[PDB]
Amino acid sequence: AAPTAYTPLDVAQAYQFPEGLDGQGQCIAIIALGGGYDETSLAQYFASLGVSAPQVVSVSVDGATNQPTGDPNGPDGEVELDIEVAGALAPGAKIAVYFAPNTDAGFLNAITTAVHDPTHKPSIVSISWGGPEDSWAPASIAAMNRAFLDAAALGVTVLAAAGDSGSTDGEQDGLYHVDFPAASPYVLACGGTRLVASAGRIERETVWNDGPDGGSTGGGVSRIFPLPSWQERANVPPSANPGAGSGRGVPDVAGNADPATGYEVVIDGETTVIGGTSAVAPLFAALVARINQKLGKPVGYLNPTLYQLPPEVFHDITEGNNDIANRARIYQAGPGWDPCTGLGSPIGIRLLQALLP
């Protein structure tokens, strides 16, 4: 009941991120379609957490540049949240922020520029922007999906937030919807939970659902992408939409996203609390950066591997639902993979151990 908050280091500790690794030798790309960041907020934040500030650079795509608006409740909140969460957990990595116009082409161009960048050479790309998969122009969905396929071929990992408006994803057409780019089978879709944890243990972790007014994790069954071969044993249910139908299940993994148990951050000079699935992609991008540093080679496309790893690698979320539109409880969490939290929250050290050759 009483609202709380954590620093990124607290959440990483709860999820047991591997120690002694900081992402040295890695580069994390962050995609931004609006706003910007200021050096004052970043320097203050990293210093406050006692970590050596990672190098952060801006890259202009299609004329867009780093332009913070100054409003802590605006897009700066998204941009700075992404950099602060990823940078605080992988401070040894270099952060490259790609700014592009808020258009379908800008979104695509930012992704491809980051993926093929010979100067910054990112090994990981984190995305916290999106929209209902069925509201996108089919041609755009195709181009972006191929960009993600190319990234997988090049050994670059791509992570994306699953959404903050439950199973209906903000649409009021009497149907359930999943978000894109999260729906792409080549993206690691990140869902959200309500985490109650301390340094040594997780007391409780449930589906993030604060009703219509507070938001809920995105999740469901795609109506565009078929069920991937590597996800056929996860027991993804048929769509809840009349007519049913098999499809790629969203999300793949999940992490703390409930604003009521959110992240303490500094946005445009203001210390505040922010949540949402937007925080989960950069959180796990940092985890991947640590793993890559240890392995000496980038893990790149992880989805196929994740679904065949032993279940002990994840913390299974079984309680709650992401329905904020009606009383039907579509969709509900349960044992194993579900359309609210996927495989659950990852156990960092167990994931690294399982990925060691």
Which of 104, 316 has the CB closer to Ca ion?
316
- Nearer to Ca ion (CB atom), residue 31 or residue 250: 250
Per-residue contact track with Ca ion, 312 to 351, x per CB under 5 A? ----xx--------------------x-------------
| DSSP three-state, residue 57 | strand
Q: Which is nearer to Ca ion, 204 or 294 (CB)?
A: 204
Least separation in angstroms between residue 206's CB and Ca ion is 10
Contact 74, 35 (CB under 8 A): yes
72 in Cβ contact with 268 (< 8 Å)? yes
Given the residues 264, 278, 323, 345, select the one marked as catalytic. 278
DSSP string, 287-336: HHHHHHHHHSS-----HHHHTTS-GGGEE---S-B---SSSS--SB--SS
Please indicate whether residue 123 is annotated as part of the active site: no
78 is catalytic: yes
- 334 labeled binding residue: yes
* 147 close to 139: Cβ distance less than 8 angstroms: no
Binding to Ca ion (CB under 5 A) within 214-243 occurs at none
Residue with smaller CB distance to Ca ion, 32 or 317 = 317
DSSP assigned state of 264 = E
Number of residues that bind Ca ion (CB under 5 A): 3
**Cα 70 to Cα 40, 73, 95, distances in angstroms:** 12, 9, 21
The reply, when asked if residue 268 is annotated as ligand binding, is no
Q: Using CB under 5 A, which of the segments 58-66, 223-231, 239-247, 309-317 binds Ca ion?
A: 309-317
Query: What's the min distance (Å) between Cβ of 217 and Ca ion?
Result: 12
What's the CA gap between 37 and 88, in Å, rounded? 15
Chain centroid to Cα 275, Å, comes to: 12
User: Any catalytic annotation for residue 128?
Assistant: no
CA separation for the pair 278, 269 (Å, rounded): 20
83 is in an annotated binding site: no
- The catalytic residues are 78, 82, 278
Binding residues (CB under 5 A) for Ca ion: these are 316-317, 338
Binding-site residues for Ca(2+) sit at 316-317, 334, 336, 338
